[PDB]
Design a protein around this ligand. Structure first.
Ligand code: CLM
Ligand code: MG
Ligand code: MG
Ligand code: MG
Ligand code: MG
Ligand code: MG
Ligand code: MG
Ligand code: MG
Ligand code: MG
Ligand code: MG
Ligand code: MG
Ligand code: MG
Ligand code: MG
Ligand code: MG
Ligand code: MG
Ligand code: MG
Ligand code: MG
Ligand code: MG
Ligand code: MG
Ligand code: MG
Ligand code: MG
Ligand code: MG
Ligand code: MG
Ligand code: MG
Ligand code: MG
Ligand code: MG
Ligand code: MG
Ligand code: MG
Ligand code: ZN
Lengths: 48, 56, 95, 36, 111, 142, 30
RNA sequence: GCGAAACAGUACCGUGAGGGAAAGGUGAAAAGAACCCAGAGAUGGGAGUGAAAUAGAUUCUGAAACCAUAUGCCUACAACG
RNA sequence: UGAGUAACGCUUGGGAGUGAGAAUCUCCCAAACCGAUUGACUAAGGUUUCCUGGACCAGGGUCGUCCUUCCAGGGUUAGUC
């Protein structure tokens, strides 16, 4: 069946990318929180 | 259906009492002496006086 | 110009298959940020014979030593395939 | 002969152990056994 | 400066080996050890490995080498004194060369 | 005088190995080898190797006759297990337990070997009681 | 002869066995 | 005890925000077992080092549940918290 | 404990060879299914899973000398796509 996640290299980068997060106050706050937790994968940009 | 009471370690062994193995009957080859299970060709391919297969 | 864009020559089965038969093809590894024109200029300023043409390869990094206690990634390589004109064959070692 | 290992890392019994996340996202539904 | 240097005669004041005189061949300051020749002889069971031009032979049987010894167990050996003894050293600075020199405290012998 | 051989983390399960080990206990050397060489079981070509190694180190290391060896005790102790996740239906999951056995075979030359083991147990008990009596004598002495 | 004896196995880094260079076998493994 | 004594906000889960583990100790010193035997090998049994090898890398001590072996006693007309 | 129980998720026979060990690996001959497809080219996605040699700790619902698993080396060439 058609499952929920259909992978797309563009949709992912344009929705959860660094530039998408750095365009609104809410995204900046989310990135600040992730830096506080010291996440190695800050966003979906750093896939590798 | 599933056991409403756990089976102890004694009923388990009582059921396994019939799970013992039996020793297969063996005989001696008449040309090389090694033991082979009865009524079967030996390791040399020599059954009785008949050369069945080439030696191992 | 600075000639830091010629890191290391590489010798494989493919390289030696090409490096024989009239036109020679020499394969080096170069700065991944360098362009074809920079590669030709470096060969000019460090060897002296103008390349006939240059081809470039980008080998993506991949996982190595998988399953080992500490796994590691590979290193990004840019390969350059210089081809000198007919009848000329220079040595990579010895100047 | 020529059986040796001079590399700093070399082993044939590679160390590994599989783990379990205990993924048991099980559910259930309704029934025809309703006495109302 | 340091109590024990590379070259001076030294003895052991504790352990199975008592009164073992030797010359320090090498000093590890980080691990506070000291290799003294002729002392602490260990015999590794030398196996055979062949993966290199030198490893093609690598003839090693019961080679006895030197095991490092803690620097605390070592004590400097006196030589200038007619009756040699084990003592502690000072760090006086003589104004002739303004250089620090070790001098024993149970005598007046330099180094 | 018991000679023995061991094998850690044998892939066979203890349940399926004890069935084969019970076919050789108390048997003579040559007959045990003959019985184990023609039994169509997986845990027959592994107990055979252990048995052969045990004979070798009994007649070479410990210096035994070789015509008096009998299988004293062959057992398959429980070894470390390995846990895996088998994917079930409807999103559930179960745990597969890969079982391992620690195999050990022991042969003796003396047909009365149990007596010495009981004797050693008795000696330990006697030393405990002897210690108690000497302590009692010391208590009364003071 | 000698180069035949020195070309069997002893695989070089970037190469394999069999196709060992007919002239270049004295640099890496010297 | 900080979630984190180890390379932990890691492995892993989720599209995402987010959620989030377990895991330490050989020996004073590797002196980490040359060599022999069985085996295809791992490995095991000897040898050797070591005070100790039932301290051997599965590495301080090693409890119970659990699984096997055995000395002694009892048990195949028997209704059993 | 259930219990060595249910299950092991659509495909046969033989000859020769390797190997310590072969219904399962290699070659050959057949045999059986696909054939608007289990055939061929690519987009998306996957990210080395591709080729060669070696290995059989672990994974492969059995076995394994074999693998899309692991180790070492190598592989992607544009003025016109
Ligand atoms: O809940 C049920 N029955 C209950 C069990 O406690 C009871 O037996 C019952 C059965 C029938 C009924 N009725 O018919 O009205 C009412 C209660 C069934 Cl619907 Cl599963
Ligand atoms: Mg029992
Ligand atoms: Mg039964
Ligand atoms: Mg290009
Ligand atoms: Mg599913
Ligand atoms: Mg269970
Ligand atoms: Mg993720
Ligand atoms: Mg031992
Ligand atoms: Mg344990
Ligand atoms: Mg312990
Ligand atoms: Mg009765
Ligand atoms: Mg009656
Ligand atoms: Mg009654
Ligand atoms: Mg009664
Ligand atoms: Mg349970
Ligand atoms: Mg069971
Ligand atoms: Mg049943
Ligand atoms: Mg049934
Ligand atoms: Mg069935
Ligand atoms: Mg199937
Ligand atoms: Mg079938
Ligand atoms: Mg058809
Ligand atoms: Mg198709
Ligand atoms: Mg991979
Ligand atoms: Mg392949
Ligand atoms: Mg292969
Ligand atoms: Mg298997
Ligand atoms: Mg062209
Ligand atoms: Zn015969």
């Amino acid at each position: 069946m058609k499952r929920t996640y259909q992978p797309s290299k563009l949709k992912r980068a344009k929705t959860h990318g660094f530039l998408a997060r750095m365009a609104t106050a809410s995204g900046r706050k989310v990135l600040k929180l992730r830096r506080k937790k010291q996440r190695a994968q800050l966003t979906v940009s750093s896939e590798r | 259906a599933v056991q409403q009471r756990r089976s102890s370690k004694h009923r388990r062994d009582k059921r396994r009492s019939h799970d013992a193995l039996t020793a297969q009957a063996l005989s001696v080859c008449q040309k090389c002496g090694k033991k082979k299970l009865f009524h079967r060709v030996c390791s040399c391919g020599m059954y009785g006086d008949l050369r069945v297969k080439k030696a191992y | 110009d600075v000639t830091n864009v010629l890191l290391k020559p590489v010798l494989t089965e493919k390289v030696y298959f090409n490096q024989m038969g009239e036109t020679k093809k020499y394969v080096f590894v170069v700065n991944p940020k360098a362009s074809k024109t920079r590669v030709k200029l470096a060969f000019e300023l460090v060897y002296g014979i103008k390349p006939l043409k240059v081809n470039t390869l980008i080998r993506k990094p991949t996982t190595i030593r998988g399953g080992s206690r500490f796994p590691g990634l590979s290193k990004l390589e840019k390969l350059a395939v210089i081809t000198l004109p007919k009848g000329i064959a220079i040595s990579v070692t010895g100047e | 002969x020529x059986x040796x290992x001079x590399x700093x890392x070399x082993x044939x019994x590679x160390x590994x152990x599989x783990x379990x996340x205990x993924x048991x996202x099980x559910x259930x539904x309704x029934x025809x056994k309703a006495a109302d | 400066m340091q109590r024990i240097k590379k070259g001076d005669k030294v003895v052991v004041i504790t352990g199975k080996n008592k009164g073992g005189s030797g010359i320090v061949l090498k000093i590890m300051p980080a691990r506070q050890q000291a290799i003294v020749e002729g002392l602490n002889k260990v015999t590794r069971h030398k196996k055979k490995d062949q993966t290199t031009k030198r490893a093609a032979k690598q003839s090693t049987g019961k080679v006895q080498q030197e095991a490092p010894i803690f620097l605390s167990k070592l004590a400097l050996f006196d030589q200038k004194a007619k009756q040699q003894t084990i003592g502690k050293i000072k760090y006086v600075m003589d104004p002739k060369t303004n250089k620090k020199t070790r001098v024993f405290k149970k005598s007046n012998n330099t180094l | 005088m018991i000679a023995f051989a061991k094998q850690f983390r044998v892939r066979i399960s203890p349940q399926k190995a004890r069935l084969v080990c019970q076919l050789i206990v108390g048997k003579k050397t040559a007959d045990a080898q003959n019985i184990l060489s023609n039994t169509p079981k997986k845990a027959a070509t592994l107990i055979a190797k252990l048995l052969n190694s045990a004979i070798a180190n009994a007649t070479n290391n410990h210096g035994m006759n070789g015509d008096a060896l009998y299988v004293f005790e062959c057992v398959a102790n429980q070894g470390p297990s390995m846990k895996r996740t088998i994917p079930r239906a409807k999103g559930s999951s179960n745990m597969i337990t890969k079982r391992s056995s620690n195999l050990v075979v022991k042969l003796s030359d003396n047909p009365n070997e149990r007596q010495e083991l009981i004797k050693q147990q008795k000696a330990l008990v006697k030393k405990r009681v002897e210690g108690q009596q000497k302590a009692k004598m010391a208590r009364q002495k003071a | 002869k000698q180069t035949q004896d020195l070309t069997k196995n002893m695989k070089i880094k970037g190469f394999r066995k069999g196709k060992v260079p007919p002239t270049l076998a004295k640099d890496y493994l010297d």
